Amino acid sequence: GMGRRKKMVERVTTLMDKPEFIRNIGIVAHIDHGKTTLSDNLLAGAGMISLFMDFDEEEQKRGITIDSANVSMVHEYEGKEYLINLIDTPGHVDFGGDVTRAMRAVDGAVVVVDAVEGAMPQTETVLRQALRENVVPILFINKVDRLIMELKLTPQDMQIRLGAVIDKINKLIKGMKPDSYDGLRLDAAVGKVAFGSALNNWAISVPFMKKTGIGFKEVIEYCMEDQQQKLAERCPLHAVVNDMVIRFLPNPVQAQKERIKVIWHGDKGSEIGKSMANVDPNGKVALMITDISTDPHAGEVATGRLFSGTLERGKEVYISGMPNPNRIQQVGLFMGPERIEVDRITAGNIVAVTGLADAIVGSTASTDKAMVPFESIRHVSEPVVTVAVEAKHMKDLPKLVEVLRQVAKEDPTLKVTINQETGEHLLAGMGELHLEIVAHRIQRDKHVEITTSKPLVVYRETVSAHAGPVEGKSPNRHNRFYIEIEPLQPAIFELVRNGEISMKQQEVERRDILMKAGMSKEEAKGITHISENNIFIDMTKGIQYLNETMELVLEGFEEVIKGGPLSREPVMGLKVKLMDAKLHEDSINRGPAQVIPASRQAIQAAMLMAGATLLEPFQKVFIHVPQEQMGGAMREIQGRRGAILDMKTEGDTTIIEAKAPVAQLFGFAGDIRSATEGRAMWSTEFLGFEPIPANMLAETVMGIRQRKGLKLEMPKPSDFISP
Ligand SMILES: Nc1nc2c(ncn2[C@@H]2O[C@H](COP(=O)(O)OP(=O)(O)CP(=O)(O)O)[C@@H](O)[C@H]2O)c(=O)[nH]1
Numbered sequence: 001g002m003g004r005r006k007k008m009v010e011r012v013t014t015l016m017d018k019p020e021f022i023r024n025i026g027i028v029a030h031i032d033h034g035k036t037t038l039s040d041n042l043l044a045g046a047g048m049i050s051l052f053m054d055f056d057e058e059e060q061k062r063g064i065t066i067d068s069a070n071v072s073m074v075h076e077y078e079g080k081e082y083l084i085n086l087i088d089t090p091g092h093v094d095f096g097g098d099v100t101r102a103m104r105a106v107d108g109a110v111v112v113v114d115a116v117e118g119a120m121p122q123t124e125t126v127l128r129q130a131l132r133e134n135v136v137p138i139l140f141i142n143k144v145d146r147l148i149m150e151l152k153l154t155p156q157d158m159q160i161r162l163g164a165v166i167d168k169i170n171k172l173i174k175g176m177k178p179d180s181y182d183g184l185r186l187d188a189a190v191g192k193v194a195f196g197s198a199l200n201n202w203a204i205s206v207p208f209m210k211k212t213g214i215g216f217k218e219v220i221e222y223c224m225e226d227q228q229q230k231l232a233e234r235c236p237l238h239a240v241v242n243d244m245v246i247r248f249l250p251n252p253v254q255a256q257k258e259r260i261k262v263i264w265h266g267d268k269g270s271e272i273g274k275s276m277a278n279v280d281p282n283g284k285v286a287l288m289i290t291d292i293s294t295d296p297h298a299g300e301v302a303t304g305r306l307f308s309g310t311l312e313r314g315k316e317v318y319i320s321g322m323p324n325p326n327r328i329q330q331v332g333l334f335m336g337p338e339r340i341e342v343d344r345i346t347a348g349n350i351v352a353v354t355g356l357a358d359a360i361v362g363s364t365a366s367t368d369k370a371m372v373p374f375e376s377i378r379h380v381s382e383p384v385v386t387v388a389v390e391a392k393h394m395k396d397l398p399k400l401v402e403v404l405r406q407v408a409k410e411d412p413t414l415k416v417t418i419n420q421e422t423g424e425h426l427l428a429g430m431g432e433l434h435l436e437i438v439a440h441r442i443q444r445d446k447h448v449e450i451t452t453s454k455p456l457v458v459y460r461e462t463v464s465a466h467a468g469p470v471e472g473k474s475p476n477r478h479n480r481f482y483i484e485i486e487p488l489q490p491a492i493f494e495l496v497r498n499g500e501i502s503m504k505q506q507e508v509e510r511r512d513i514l515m516k517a518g519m520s521k522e523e524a525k526g527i528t529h530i531s532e533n534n535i536f537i538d539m540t541k542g543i544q545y546l547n548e549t550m551e552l553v554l555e556g557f558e559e560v561i562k563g564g565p566l567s568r569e570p571v572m573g574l575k576v577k578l579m580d581a582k583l584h585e586d587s588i589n590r591g592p593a594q595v596i597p598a599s600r601q602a603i604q605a606a607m608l609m610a611g612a613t614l615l616e617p618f619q620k621v622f623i624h625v626p627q628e629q630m631g632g633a634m635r636e637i638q639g640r641r642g643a644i645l646d647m648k649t650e651g652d653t654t655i656i657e658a659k660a661p662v663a664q665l666f667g668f669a670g671d672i673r674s675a676t677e678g679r680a681m682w683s684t685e686f687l688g689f690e691p692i693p694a695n696m697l698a699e700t701v702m703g704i705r706q707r708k709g710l711k712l713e714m715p716k717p718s719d720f721i722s723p
């Protein structure tokens, strides 16, 4: 009934124009805590369908969510209908990029937590990703049936266990956002927490129990008596959870002004800032592109969040960084399960658009070319595992290049390196599963048979000392650049890594952040380029033509950051300082082909003078094992160059927290299973890049150079600079 496609078309299209009645939400959780069962049962309970959501063949075969999925529901609350745009997100750490992209589109998050496992490593990760986006969280504690049936827990004890979960989530919130904790605090008594069984279609909350005249003792009886279906009639999952969504997650009128504080360095008082804050359909277009996907019938689809304005077929918008207007072909919304085309979409909605040929993940699409773009969408960690990929058949060579480029466009937590001169392309990602799924879907969906090499790690290059000034010279000798280099301080690197500083911020705003983190006032005032992991500082004054030349100097800097001089691995942790410069007065002698090499070579040589070295990625590993198998678990992790960071005993089980190099964790799944007779449960989180041992530098570098087909000799500064 309510979910009839044409009755939902009319109901959604009516609600679409009423931002008060919209809720843009993501469902987020540690792996297997029940996101998709919840999403599926909300859709079913709400009438939108008759697990549906895991559409991909591999998601059903593996019982894992691989891609974010967009659906919507219409839900009545206090005699009014509301449009709930829902994004179900992957739990596995390898697909975390989908969580980060989903979080940019939504204003509220249902954090799902398993009552049995409690808060887990990615519970913290997704909560942090929500709070960094100014997304409001509520809590659904799931699998309460198991808590009741497998632990036979009494009304008072089950309560104590559920309360501990709530307190833990609140502690995480308070630690992440101390200044907004009071507003964000989860209170079971008002109803910001619900508890239930997504699998069995029931849920309760403290206020709902105090009104249904139902107690927790009755819930235990329903489960013990194998009458959970009768419980689902009295305490419907969709009614309790969707009510909580409407009552506690924000509409776009409430949320957009909060979202733009963190996703946009523009002025909230500018014309576009006010239109976005007011969710104005008659403002100019401001569209945040969060996802690129490929449709069988429609072609490429750009999904995103429309903050201001109205979109319709034929309307033209600029794409940030690109010169020409792109023309919308179709616009669509998610209506229950289905992405349906509509005549026009308005601010406040999550939208799907075709025709934006230049759009990428993170693009700003706008009516005015000059609009300040939204911030990039940055994932919590970067690629650490790589394989070589090659077509099995010479007729598929050009197609494989298009396929790999499209794969990385659709998931920028992958990094593709095309080689059209050998065909041995490189694919880097977050983990082995990440790359296994990509390879499978190339063969299945794109019909290109491929080989992949054994996985290897991706290192990072950095420096470990100060060097300079070092002079780089243009090929015509007319232009000179004098560079000093040193490692970033940890607190500064964190600001850069977290995007807390930006060249888009007011100079005063940015410099105060840097100085409070320990940077001197001249370096803070001189910062001119903040890359993803490195900074460039201009210490000069009065050098004529330098401002117009600085973009070329920074291009040379970016070229080095893509692959450092030790082994062509990505560079991180650099503070590069321009101390002096000499420029020819005529622009014909200081164009890109003159200035870019001069900047690049000075930085390359300075790195080799500054104790250049390699960093290797480490994972944090969390191993939950019964006491009987703790010896095998400890031995397995310590045999892989692992170090134990913590051991916590809870009952007759131990939670081991350890760290180990990614390069030492291949085959861990099978080895930890046999070492513990299948009893270990384990998860991971990326820890960071750490310095390789000093007496392994030459051999590590030579091995990388060998793998890449580079010169079999250690680089030296004279390879880059000459008299
Ligand atoms: N007993 C019980 N099992 C549940 C409940 N909710 C989900 N499950 C079970 O947990 C497993 C995972 O459920 P699923 O909904 O796919 O979780 P998910 O968090 O989406 C998995 P991913 O992180 O890969 O996306 C399934 O076997 C499912 O039936 C519940 O309320 N009770």
Ligand SMILES: [Cl-]
Pocket (backbone or CB within 6 Å): 487, 488, 489, 492, 519, 575
């Ligand atoms: Cl610094």
Ligand SMILES: [Mg+2]
Pocket (backbone or CB within 6 Å): 034, 035, 036, 037, 064, 065, 089, 090, 091
């Ligand atoms: Mg799922």
